[PDB]
């Protein structure tokens, strides 16, 4: 499949490149037009410049349920093995695999061969999860996250067992174009639920920090609903998106990256407008 | 795409899908007359079958499975240059 | 990075004529001219 996979990658990158070019043309026309309509002033740099909406990789989101594989870094800690066990229950149909002396590239080829849709890798620091990598395997995007405030079900006594049904999804706070891009990657990890499902999973954006919450609700009576929090609780902060798979750091391009040493980096946010 | 691209098909598109020019794209040959010549002696096979007709349009799927036939003098030279000749495989 | 990406689409079956790559009378003549 070396020859076939190379051909499909080139045409995919070709179509992606054209979409970016036409959008950049729109922004230049839009920013130029609004400036003169204001009639306030003409920036000198503006003077110098003047003188398939659905993502291509996500063909098959609605037709078939996603298949998710979860693994860790080599020689996992005790608590990291518990966290990967909980993430398996969060995602319907997910599977968790032991990472032995497995090369990263060897994992990706096995996942592609068996039709695994998405691959999750989690890192830890002194027994607490600190990083998460989400990769869409058929040459899809790879997103890199850092975890901030992880609270596990194992820490909390006598919770019980979860509903494990297909949950409803809530996306809140994602307004910019990048935020729309990010929320798509998180949403497509989940299958199409049922209308009468009582399981709710929430992604809420606040100053480029994404909060993950898991809940089940019961309607005792009209207009009054009671929420009981279940499942792990953590925060996500994106810092990089790459076009290729996680076997391709050295060749894939960067769609978006966070730049913290910029003179105005402190006061700027990218997931909201 | 849509029917807009359908108006660009010409004789050039058909000529690009011929077997000798695919070899020239795949860098199996460097000249068209050399690419044509390889075909009739039978050094080129499309999967299990060997094709000797230069007028032969290869599909995208079949393009992945074109290679040198085994026990061919050209394949010996390729293996010799790569220092990967194994006489057990003939 | 540009060199590395070329290696991904490298064809193992690619072939070039450069891959395939004196006489005693001439060799004796050179030695006679040398002396």
């Amino acid at each position: 499949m070396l020859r076939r996979e190379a051909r499909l990658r080139r045409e995919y990158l070709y179509r992606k490149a054209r979409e970016e070019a036409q959008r950049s043309a729109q922004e230049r026309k839009e920013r130029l037009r609004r400036a003169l309509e204001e009639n306030r002033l003409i920036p000198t740099e503006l003077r110098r410049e003047a003188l398939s909406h659905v993502d291509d990789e996500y063909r098959w989101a609605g037709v078939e349920d996603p298949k998710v594989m979860i693994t860790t870094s080599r020689d996992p800690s005790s608590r990291l093995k518990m966290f990967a066990k909980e993430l398996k229950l969060v995602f319907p149909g997910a599977q968790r695999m032991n990472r032995g002396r497995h090369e990263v590239g060897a994992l990706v080829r096995a996942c592609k061969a068996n039709g695994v849709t998405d691959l999750l890798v989690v890192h830890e620091h002194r027994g607490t999860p600190v990083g998460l990598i989400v990769s869409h395997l058929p040459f899809g995007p790879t997103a890199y996250f850092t975890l901030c405030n992880v609270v596990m079900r194992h820490d909390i006594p006598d919770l019980g067992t979860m509903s494990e049904a297909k949950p409803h999804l809530i996306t809140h706070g994602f307004s910019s174009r990048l935020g729309k891009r990010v929320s798509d990657i998180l949403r497509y990890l989940f299958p199409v639920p049922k209308d009468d499902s009582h399981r709710v999973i929430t992604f809420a954006n606040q100053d480029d920090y994404i909060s993950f919450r898991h809940h089940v609700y019961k309607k005792t009576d009209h207009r009054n609903v009671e929420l009981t929090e279940v499942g792990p609780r953590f925060e996500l902060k994106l810092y990089m998106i790459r076009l290729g798979t996680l076997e391709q750091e050295a060749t894939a391009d960067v769609e978006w990256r966070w730049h913290p040493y910029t003179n105005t980096a402190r006061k700027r946010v990218f997931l909201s407008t | 795409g849509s029917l807009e691209l359908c108006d660009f098909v010409t004789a050039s598109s058909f000529c690009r899908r011929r077997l000798p020019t695919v070899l020239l794209k795949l860098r199996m040959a460097q000249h068209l007359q050399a690419a044509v010549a390889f075909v009739e002696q039978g050094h080129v096979r499309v999967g299990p079958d060997v094709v000797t007709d230069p007028a032969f349009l290869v599909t995208r799927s079949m393009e992945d499975f074109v290679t040198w036939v085994d026990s061919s003098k050209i394949k010996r030279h390729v293996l010799e240059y790569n220092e990967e000749r194994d006489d057990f495989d003939l | 990075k540009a060199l590395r990406k070329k290696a991904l689409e490298k064809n193992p079956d690619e072939f070039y004529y450069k891959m395939t790559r004196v006489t005693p009378e001439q060799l004796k003549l050179m030695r006679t001219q040398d002396v």
């Binding site: 990158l13 | 004789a11 050039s12 000529c15 690009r16 020019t21 695919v22 794209k25 | 540009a2």
Partner: peptide
């Protein structure tokens, strides 16, 4: 009519031309 056989467009489509132009520019810069 097809182009000359020596031309690279004789055996390349627009997809290959887009990738080859980017590769040629990067290598020529070095």
């Amino acid at each position: 009519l097809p182009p000359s056989p020596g031309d690279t467009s004789y055996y390349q489509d627009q997809v290959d031309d887009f990738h080859e132009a980017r590769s040629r520019a990067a290598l020529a810069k070095g």
